[PDB]
Amino acid sequence: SVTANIENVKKVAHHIQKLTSIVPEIGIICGSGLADGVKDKITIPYTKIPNFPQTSVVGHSGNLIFGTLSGRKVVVMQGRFHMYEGYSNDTVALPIRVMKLLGVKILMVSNAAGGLNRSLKLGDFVILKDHIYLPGLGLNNILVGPNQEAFGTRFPALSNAYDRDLRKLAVQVAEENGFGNLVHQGVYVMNGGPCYETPAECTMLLNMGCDVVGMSTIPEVVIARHCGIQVFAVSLVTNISVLDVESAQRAELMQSWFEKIIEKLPKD
Amino acid sequence: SVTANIENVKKVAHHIQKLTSIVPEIGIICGSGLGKLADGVKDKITIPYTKIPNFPQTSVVGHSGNLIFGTLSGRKVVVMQGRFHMYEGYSNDTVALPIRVMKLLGVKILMVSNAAGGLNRSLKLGDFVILKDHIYLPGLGLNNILVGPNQEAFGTRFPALSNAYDRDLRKLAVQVAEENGFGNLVHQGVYVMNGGPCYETPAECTMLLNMGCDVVGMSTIPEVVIARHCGIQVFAVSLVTNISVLDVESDLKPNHEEVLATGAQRAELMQSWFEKIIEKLPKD
Amino acid sequence: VTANIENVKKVAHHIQKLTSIVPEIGIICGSGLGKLADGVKDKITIPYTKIPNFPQTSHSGNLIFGTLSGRKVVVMQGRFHMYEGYSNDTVALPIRVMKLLGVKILMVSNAAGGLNRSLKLGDFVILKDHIYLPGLGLNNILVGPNQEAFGTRFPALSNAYDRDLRKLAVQVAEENGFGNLVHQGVYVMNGGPCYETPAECTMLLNMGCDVVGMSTIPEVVIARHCGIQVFAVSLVTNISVLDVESDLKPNHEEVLATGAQRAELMQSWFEKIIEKLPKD
Ligand SMILES: Nc1nc2c(Cc3cccnc3)c[nH]c2c(=O)[nH]1
Ligand SMILES: Nc1nc2c(Cc3cccnc3)c[nH]c2c(=O)[nH]1
Ligand SMILES: Nc1nc2c(Cc3cccnc3)c[nH]c2c(=O)[nH]1
Question: What is the main EC category here (chain C) (predicted)?
Fold first, then answer.
């Protein structure tokens, strides 16, 4: 890993700009579980980008996808970097800082999560309105280390981290497209991973006021807000958390939802 | 330290197999209270960690740890004498390797004891608390022993911990305690790991109790996580070596000498308990 | 360099060659103790940069020896915070150096957010206990081989915030007419460097925490480990926001400003405490 400072980020941004003329205004991290629908698209493999972080192979590398979507210029990250895999703070931060320099103003991110809130059902959508960053509370915050002042301040507040206006809009779109009944808003808590929670851990997290639980996202969100990118994030409830020791389907819908949100985003 | 990958683990397992012919089916990590257990082992061969290439090395005021093979209640066991605790600064790979070596040697069941403070207010000094679940605070916080590339030869990328403390082994242990006349000492509860090496402040204890924790210690969970990852069945018990202090105004305090002494007091009972459990384990 | 007896001895001896003051009280100036450094009489200033192997800061820090209310003190101007990326050994060494120099009591101030709903801006919250979130999570300053020359493998934190020093500090505030500003409570450490979200604040409050900050606990842990008595106060520089719907937010400039506002009061308070410390 190398440092996500202005110098290195500039270098990566410029290489990318030589491969495409698209200036992205919206960044999309897709998680669980569209990229096609993107029109006039060019695909850049991470492997073709000097110093861009590399992904988990098996046989297949990640891609950066530029193009348009609902008439908006977007860049899509296909292939994420998760802390449980062992990646450094700098590795996880760089792609987000590269988006900033490329022009990105809004980050949209989806993930899969377990449902703690007892009123949640399988397949529900839970818009993040706040989070609890357990690793960050415990000295593994993605921002630990010298601050890169070119991107943001030493002590960031996370006041309106999940932009309330984007949340309102997303609810409105779901409502008028007839699935407002699947959509909730709640608190996402990050478990460092890679283990699923024990029933005791789930019970503790619920009593902590958490609604859903996952292993991702918060580090990106922290980096995004740090450099002034607006954030929208949703969890797909892919399972109901088990609280007692004694104890691809929604993809099309989710894609359509993001597509219809982007179409209504206020454009400068 | 060497990565706990299949290559390195294989190498260590093979060296050990050259020093003994015992194929262990039960693995025992002696904590507080299992000091005497090591002795009762019959037909035993002792292998010092120092004689095992690439096996992690221990601390014990100079004296090295040992691996002890032999039989116990007619069952073939391997006993780890000397553990690796995270607060000592050991790596994830160091702590994981011994457990993965057991897997390749044939181990099917891991039995582990430890000492812990009593958070649940109904607990008494010297009580036995069988773990039925845990809260892995370091794991929640990105210091999970499994962080890093997954070793697929041993297990999956995203393990569930559904029945981590095998319910059948727990039921059996309760039965053995009951019929041998000490069922009144035995409880079941949730163990929470504090990374250590400090004892908890009263405020921390109060928080952990309200979190739903019954006992608190500094060990064990990492081994249990590695064991479950590679499909070994787990049985674990805490000896309550002290009552957690919840009030800043108190003058009671955790004393490591008193912790060691309680362990030594219940040691004979605990050894007998493990010995009688092993004797009733369903044998393939 | 490892904070072992050999390295600490080396640093202690170098310092002792630059000054004859044997300190009995150690002061870590946080938010509010800016002015305290000045009031120190007969003072010699030693810059960290002149001390071989002493940790380096992020203008350099200084070690200030001298007297204060007739007592011999050493003042650390410039701290080492974990969020900056410093090692356990780096944070621990200065405190271990104090031990060898003669320090018996550590006084520390910091700035914190107010979780307890009864707290007001500019209040003083004497620490009577703490919750060490990084410590619970395997990032305890003491992780690693134990340095036996300084203390035991498994330290208790029974009376970490000496009850007698707390009682005294309350008495001093009371008789000097600001007893109404002073509370006692539980301090929780957030590793940092981010301010807490409303959800995190809500969780921390329900955990039983009164104030939240990013410092102090590691030094306290090292101090208690080697048997130094500890006194620590938080200045409430902001009220924690518990609601996502609010438009109030933590502002570092307002944090700095509140600190500077109460600085004179805080200095006077530490000065009048030291004056009443039982002297061997
Ligand atoms: N911590 C946690 N994460 C998840 C996820 C996210 C995930 C996990 C593994 C593979 N792919 C995605 C889904 N459910 C949960 C959960 O319950 N807890
Ligand atoms: N955190 C915590 N740990 C323990 C232990 C574990 C132990 C092992 C060896 C020596 N000393 C302690 C026992 N009791 C406690 C406890 O109360 N809290
Ligand atoms: N975590 C947290 N810390 C603080 C502080 C301390 C501080 C020191 C340096 C810069 N900024 C803040 C003051 N208030 C808070 C807070 O609310 N939360």
Answer: transferase
Q: How far is C41 from chain A (nearest CA, A)?
A: 35
Give Cβ neighbours of residue C18 (< 8 Å, ≥ 6 apart). Answer: C44, C46, C50
Residue C180 CA to residue B75 CA, distance in Å, equals 70
Element (H, E) at B209: helix B202-210
CA of A237 to the centre of ligand 1 (A): 9
What is the C-alpha to C-alpha distance for residues A163 and A98, in angstroms, rounded to an integer? 21
CA B268 to ligand 3 center in whole angstroms: 52
Q: What six digits make up the tokens of C269?
A: 């308070």
Report, in angstroms and rounded to the nearest whole number, the Rg of chain A calculated over CA atoms. 18
The whole-angstrom distance between residue C217's C-alpha and the CA centroid of its chain comes to 8
Longest dimension (CA), chain C: 58
Q: What pairs with residue A192 in β-bridges?
A: none
- Comparing C-alpha atoms, which of B107, B104, B82 is closest to residue B94? B82
- Phi then psi for residue B76, to 5 deg, are -85, 120
Q: How far is C189 from chain B (nearest CA, A)?
A: 12
- Residue A194: which residues within 8 A CB-CB, separation 6 or more? A84, A215, B144, B146, B147, B150, B157, B158, B159
How determined? X-ray
Residue with tokens 């011994």: B98
Residue C57 host element (H or E): none
Question: Which amino acid is located at C34 in the chain?
Answer: G
Q: Which tokens is C160 given?
A: 């970490």
Written as one string, the DSSP assignment of C130-197 is: EEEHHHHTT--TT-SS--TTT--SS---TTSS-HHHHHHHHHHHHHTT-GGGEEEEEEEE---SSPPP
Rounded CA separation A170/A214 (Å): 21
Cβ proximity of C94 and C80 under 8 Å: yes
Ligand 1: residue whose CA is nearest its atom 11: A112
CA distance B214 to B120: 5
Resolution in A: 2.3
DSSP B129-144: EEEEEEEEHHIIIII-
Please give the DSSP secondary-structure letter assigned to residue B72: E
Cα(C91)–Cα(C86) distance, integer angstroms: 7
3-state helix, strand, coil in chain C (%, to 5): 35, 25, 40
How far apart are alpha carbons C215 and B152 in whole angstroms? 40
